[PDB]
Design brief:
This is part of a larger assembly, with 1 copy of chain A and 2 copies of chain B.
Chain A lengths: L1 H28 L6 H9 L5 H5 L3 H6 L17 E2 L5
Chain B lengths: L3 E3 L4 E5 L4 E3 L2 E3 L4 E5 L9 H4 L1
Antiparallel strand pairs in B: 1-2, 2-5, 3-4
Classes of the chains: A mainly alpha, B mainly beta.
Amino acid sequence: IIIWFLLLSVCLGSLIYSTAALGVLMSNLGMPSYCTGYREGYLNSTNVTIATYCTGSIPCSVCLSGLDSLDTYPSLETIQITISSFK
Amino acid sequence: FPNTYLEGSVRVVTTFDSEYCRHGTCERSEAGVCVSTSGRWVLNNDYYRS
Amino acid sequence: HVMSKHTDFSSEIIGYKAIDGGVTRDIASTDTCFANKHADFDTWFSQRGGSYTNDKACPLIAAVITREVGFVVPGLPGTILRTTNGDFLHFLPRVFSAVGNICYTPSKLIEYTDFATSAC
């Protein structure tokens, strides 16, 4: 029952990896390919984060894998800290 | 952030019996009035009083 | 992704500043690790005798520029510019030359030397 869903997820992941390999071959040799439209739109766009661009979609997110993003910086976070109370 | 009446090199602030918080740091303070000779952050507690 | 060095807008840069914990701060020679996107920062540190190792878990370097470059994003200091290769850059625009790092009070803008002991 769940094995069919697991196999579907595995096949989708394999196809996504194939598209990523096609994108690598594109970056090496060109190229008009699958993820070209997303990257072309994102480069000219003002969206510094991929979350607001792809809206959480999986194929859009993995089409942009390997590129720089604002989310990659951990130093920009600021953990809220409560100072010592008293003596 | 507490209410202020003078800003610059010298500051005067007023506080209430509630915790005040700023960017990344929340602190507890009591009601009163504080005067500082410098523009450093000031709150009413023993740590800043020392 | 691996950080790369770019030389665009190099003639418009007077100096460099460091961003740590989301708040800009001054740079010291005793620090050991930084996140850098500029190649001239190596000459800047070498003239002062500094060395460092590049890592993503270390404070970022931003350059003070005299030209309005990039656009404002809420929650981020300075301005953000994206290169033609897709890499992002950070700058500190200014209106007057006597500017270090500026923090925002609810009413006015006041410079500071240390965020921990300022009215920021």
